[PDB]
Design an enzyme around this catalytic site. Structure first.
Site, PDB file in Angstrom:
ATOM      1  N   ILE A  10       0.830  -1.209   0.000  1.00  0.00           N
ATOM      2  CA  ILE A  10       0.000   0.000   0.000  1.00  0.00           C
ATOM      3  C   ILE A  10       0.868   1.265   0.000  1.00  0.00           C
ATOM      4  CG2 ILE A  10      -2.197  -0.955   0.874  1.00  0.00           C
ATOM      5  CD1 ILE A  10      -0.905   0.600   3.599  1.00  0.00           C
ATOM      6  N   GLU A  12       4.986   3.004  -1.596  1.00  0.00           N
ATOM      7  CA  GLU A  12       6.439   2.907  -1.682  1.00  0.00           C
ATOM      8  C   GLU A  12       7.057   4.258  -1.411  1.00  0.00           C
ATOM      9  OE1 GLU A  12       7.705   0.863  -5.392  1.00  0.00           O
ATOM     10  OE2 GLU A  12       7.596  -0.968  -4.171  1.00  0.00           O
ATOM     11  N   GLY A  13       8.376   4.292  -1.484  1.00  0.00           N
ATOM     12  CA  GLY A  13       9.166   5.486  -1.247  1.00  0.00           C
ATOM     13  C   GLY A  13      10.598   5.161  -0.882  1.00  0.00           C
ATOM     14  N   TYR A  15      11.939   6.304   1.937  1.00  0.00           N
ATOM     15  CA  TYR A  15      11.732   6.062   3.378  1.00  0.00           C
ATOM     16  C   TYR A  15      11.715   4.564   3.745  1.00  0.00           C
ATOM     17  CZ  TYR A  15       9.475  10.801   3.091  1.00  0.00           C
ATOM     18  OH  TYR A  15       9.192  12.126   2.874  1.00  0.00           O
ATOM     19  N   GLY A  16      10.994   3.808   2.930  1.00  0.00           N
ATOM     20  CA  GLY A  16      10.777   2.381   3.064  1.00  0.00           C
ATOM     21  C   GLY A  16       9.451   2.010   2.438  1.00  0.00           C
ATOM     22  N   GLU A  81      -1.126   1.355  13.197  1.00  0.00           N
ATOM     23  CA  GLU A  81      -2.556   1.106  13.041  1.00  0.00           C
ATOM     24  C   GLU A  81      -2.906   1.187  11.547  1.00  0.00           C
ATOM     25  OE1 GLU A  81      -3.863   5.596  14.380  1.00  0.00           O
ATOM     26  OE2 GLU A  81      -5.550   4.261  13.908  1.00  0.00           O
ATOM     27  N   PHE A  82      -4.015   0.560  11.131  1.00  0.00           N
ATOM     28  CA  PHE A  82      -4.400   0.597   9.725  1.00  0.00           C
ATOM     29  C   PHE A  82      -5.550   1.566   9.526  1.00  0.00           C
ATOM     30  CE2 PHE A  82      -6.853  -0.943   6.004  1.00  0.00           C
ATOM     31  CZ  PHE A  82      -5.876  -0.903   5.034  1.00  0.00           C
ATOM     32  N   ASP A 127       5.988  18.041   5.514  1.00  0.00           N
ATOM     33  CA  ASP A 127       5.656  17.318   4.293  1.00  0.00           C
ATOM     34  C   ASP A 127       4.170  16.982   4.270  1.00  0.00           C
ATOM     35  OD1 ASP A 127       6.696  16.091   1.773  1.00  0.00           O
ATOM     36  OD2 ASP A 127       6.235  14.162   2.742  1.00  0.00           O
ATOM     37  N   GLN A 131      -1.605  12.597   0.069  1.00  0.00           N
ATOM     38  CA  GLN A 131      -1.300  11.158   0.243  1.00  0.00           C
ATOM     39  C   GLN A 131      -0.743  10.806   1.626  1.00  0.00           C
ATOM     40  OE1 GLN A 131       2.382   9.484  -2.179  1.00  0.00           O
ATOM     41  NE2 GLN A 131       1.377  11.221  -3.213  1.00  0.00           N
TER      42      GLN A 131
HETATM   43  N1  60K Z   1      -3.861   4.057  -1.971  1.00  0.00           N
HETATM   44  S1  60K Z   1      -5.160   4.088  -0.962  1.00  0.00           S
HETATM   45  O1  60K Z   1      -6.014   3.018  -1.327  1.00  0.00           O
HETATM   46  O2  60K Z   1      -5.681   5.390  -0.932  1.00  0.00           O
HETATM   47  C1  60K Z   1      -4.418   3.732   0.491  1.00  0.00           C
HETATM   48  C2  60K Z   1      -3.258   4.455   0.893  1.00  0.00           C
HETATM   49  C3  60K Z   1      -2.652   4.291   2.138  1.00  0.00           C
HETATM   50  C4  60K Z   1      -3.225   3.380   3.062  1.00  0.00           C
HETATM   51  N2  60K Z   1      -2.737   3.175   4.383  1.00  0.00           N
HETATM   52  N3  60K Z   1      -1.560   3.715   4.784  1.00  0.00           N
HETATM   53  C5  60K Z   1      -1.198   3.578   6.024  1.00  0.00           C
HETATM   54  C6  60K Z   1      -1.939   2.989   7.196  1.00  0.00           C
HETATM   55  O3  60K Z   1      -2.985   2.335   7.194  1.00  0.00           O
HETATM   56  N4  60K Z   1      -1.201   3.288   8.353  1.00  0.00           N
HETATM   57  C7  60K Z   1      -0.047   3.991   8.013  1.00  0.00           C
HETATM   58  C8  60K Z   1       0.927   4.470   8.853  1.00  0.00           C
HETATM   59  C9  60K Z   1       2.016   5.122   8.299  1.00  0.00           C
HETATM   60  C10 60K Z   1       2.133   5.311   6.912  1.00  0.00           C
HETATM   61  C11 60K Z   1       3.362   6.016   6.417  1.00  0.00           C
HETATM   62  O4  60K Z   1       3.540   6.226   5.071  1.00  0.00           O
HETATM   63  O5  60K Z   1       4.259   6.439   7.152  1.00  0.00           O
HETATM   64  C12 60K Z   1       1.120   4.845   6.021  1.00  0.00           C
HETATM   65  C13 60K Z   1       0.023   4.179   6.590  1.00  0.00           C
HETATM   66  C14 60K Z   1      -4.365   2.607   2.678  1.00  0.00           C
HETATM   67  C15 60K Z   1      -4.918   2.778   1.408  1.00  0.00           C
END
Ligand code: 60K
Lengths: 298, 257
Positions: A10, A12-13, A15-16, A81-82, A127, A131
């Site tokens: 879900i 990339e970057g 960062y990791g 957390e998600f 930042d 997104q």
């Molecule tokens: N592409 S989408 O369907 O819109 C999408 C995008 C992102 C997500 N979840 N991302 C994350 C999540 O659940 N906890 C996170 C905690 C940290 C980070 C980070 O980058 O540091 C990203 C997420 C789901 C669907």
């Protein structure tokens, strides 16, 4: 790490890599940031150190929760957390329909609430972009990716290779100020607020000069009266075209008197006069704020 | 400004949580305050050779005291604890830190790249990644905003006295960063202008000149005896024009408290 089942990639970057995972024992659905250290000849990246230190101090319902850090000899994993989607995907789905104002109001109030906590705990995001902002089905929005985040106990000096993508960059950064401030984060959200309203990027620049000119064409070219010291900034040029300020009825057409007022203060040229997260939260705009649930397409 | 009062309140809250055990060196069988003083002075040189920020130096010393508060270390490895901490402080505060190869070079190959990287991981594990520690440096800058018009000779001098206190665990480990930063500013202001700890700073910190007296007595003695001290890298750093040659200024004979 043996207790996690990878589900989906879900994001990339540099960062990791961020994945969607499931805890096989509790069933808890998490997001995992994989940081390869066998690759990293210089040790633990300064971003991972800065993100873990700062995020594990930042406990707020509008800041992503960092649940664990699985540190090994081979790699580094951040367990979070998600949340269902980022504001960019939500914004694209809503480009035809539109996000109703009560949901824009809820989202900006919560972003400002998370940011106020960041700032009162001496932390700059640096930042903020759609997104990097995560939303859920229960109606919440939370700040994510603290990769370029810094503790400002002592002023944070400016760095070219560690700034927000042009589109949400503050005019001070673009004109070459020696230091960051809480105001960079406010500008970022102002851009994001207008994007939610007009269904499109307010300042979609392709370069630093194209970025400035798009700002200057909308808010007018700043001068010493509007912004004292602007003509003394390193990247400032007296040769810049001198545009006039456009009316906010043309910039943000479906926005009310208060909405137009709050945004004009969030997009103030002078960082010393730009509204704070604390101040904006007291703005008459949020008098009638509610917490609606969005229309998600997962 | 909106959050300025909140930050000071939060740092005051955090500086207690991030405080190392005062008598940790007593339960440390092979290392002493002299080794620590030699190590902290050496990191002062390292900072100057690599032009690091004075906060980077302040963070490293905090990390070191904290690591040594929970970990037994032999004198042979003490410099590895200090190198990994300086590397971690640099990664946290510097725009970009010096590379690991350079840290291995300033130890004259005493350790390997692998050792430095393994200790970095150990320091991070031991400090549980809690690297955003409040420093004397941090409280000094918040205090300086209560001096309009500002005197950069007072700022440089408080920075110097604040730094001297990093060398001597005995007695400075028994004082919190905010208290040293208070004593440093009063002693700096009093030496240059003759003025004392302001009422705006009394109201802000809730610290009276009486509450600062135990720290200020020690910070005054350290200042008087500074040319005599075994460690001199800080006096050399501050006799430069960058910090208006404040180390060359003669301390007061008496404070009159
Ligand atoms: N592409 S989408 O369907 O819109 C999408 C995008 C992102 C997500 N979840 N991302 C994350 C999540 O659940 N906890 C996170 C905690 C940290 C980070 C980070 O980058 O540091 C990203 C997420 C789901 C669907």
């Amino acid at each position: 790490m043996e207790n996690f089942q990878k589900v989906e990639k879900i994001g990339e970057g540099t960062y990791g890599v961020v994945y969607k995972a499931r805890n096989k024992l509790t069933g808890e659905v998490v997001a995992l940031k994989k940081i390869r250290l066998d690759t990293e000849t210089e040790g633990v990246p300064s971003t991972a150190i800065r993100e873990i230190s700062l995020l594990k101090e930042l406990n707020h319902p509008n800041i992503v929760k960092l649940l664990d850090v699985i540190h090994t000899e081979n790699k580094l994993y951040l367990v979070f957390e998600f949340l269902h989607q980022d504001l960019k995907k939500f914004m694209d789905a809503s480009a035809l329909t539109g996000i109703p104002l009560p949901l824009i109001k809820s989202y900006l109030f919560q972003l400002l609430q998370g940011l106020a906590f960041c700032h009162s705990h001496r932390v700059l995001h640096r930042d903020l972009k759609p997104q990097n902002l995560l939303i859920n089905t229960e109606g919440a929005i939370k700040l994510a990716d603290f990769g370029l985040a810094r503790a400002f106990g002592v002023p944070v000096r400016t760095y070219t290779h560690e700034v927000v993508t042009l589109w949400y960059r503050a005019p001070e950064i673009l004109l070459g100020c020696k230091y960051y401030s809480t105001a960079v984060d406010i500008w970022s959200l102002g851009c994001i607020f207008a994007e939610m309203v007009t269904r499109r990027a307010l300042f979609p620049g392709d370069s630093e000069i194209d970025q400035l000119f798009r700002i200057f064409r909308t808010l007018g070219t700043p001068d010493e009266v509007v912004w004292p010291g602007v003509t003394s900034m390193p990247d400032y040029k007296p040769s810049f075209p001198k545009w006039a300020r456009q009316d906010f009825s043309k910039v943000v057409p479906p926005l009310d008197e208060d909405g137009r007022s709050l945004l004009s203060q969030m997009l103030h040229y002078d960082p010393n006069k730009r509204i704070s997260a604390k101040a904006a939260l007291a703005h008459p705009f949020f008098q009638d704020v509610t917490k609606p649930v969005p229309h998600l397409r997962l | 400004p909106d959050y300025h009062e909140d930050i000071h309140t939060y740092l005051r809250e955090m500086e207690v949580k991030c405080k190392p055990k005062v008598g940790y060196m007593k339960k440390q069988p092979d290392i002493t305050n002299s080794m620590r003083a030699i190590l902290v002075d050496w990191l002062v040189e390292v900072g100057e050779e690599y032009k690091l920020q004075n906060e980077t130096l302040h963070l490293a010393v905090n990390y070191i005291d904290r690591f040594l508060s929970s970990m037994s270390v032999l004198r042979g490895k003490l410099q590895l604890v200090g190198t990994a901490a300086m590397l971690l402080a640099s990664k946290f505060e510097e725009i970009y830190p010096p590379e690991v190869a350079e840290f291995v070079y300033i130890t004259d190959d005493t350790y390997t790249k692998k050792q430095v990287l393994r200790m970095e991981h150990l320091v991070l594990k031991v400090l549980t990644f809690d690297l955003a520690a409040p420093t004397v440096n941090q409280f000094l800058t918040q205090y300086f905003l209560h001096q309009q018009p500002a005197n950069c000779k007072v700022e440089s001098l408080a920075m110097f006295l604040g730094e001297l206190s990093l060398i001597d665990a005995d007695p400075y480990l028994k004082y919190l960063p905010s208290v040293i930063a208070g004593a440093a500013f009063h002693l700096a202001l009093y030496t240059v202008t003759g003025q004392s700890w302001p009422e705006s700073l009394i109201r802000k910190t809730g610290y009276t000149l009486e509450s600062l007296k135990p720290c200020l007595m020690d910070l005054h003695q350290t200042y008087l005896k500074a040319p005599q001290h075994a460690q001199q890298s800080i006096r050399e750093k501050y006799k430069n024009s960058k910090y208006h040659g404040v180390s060359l200024l003669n301390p007061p004979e008496t404070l009159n408290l």
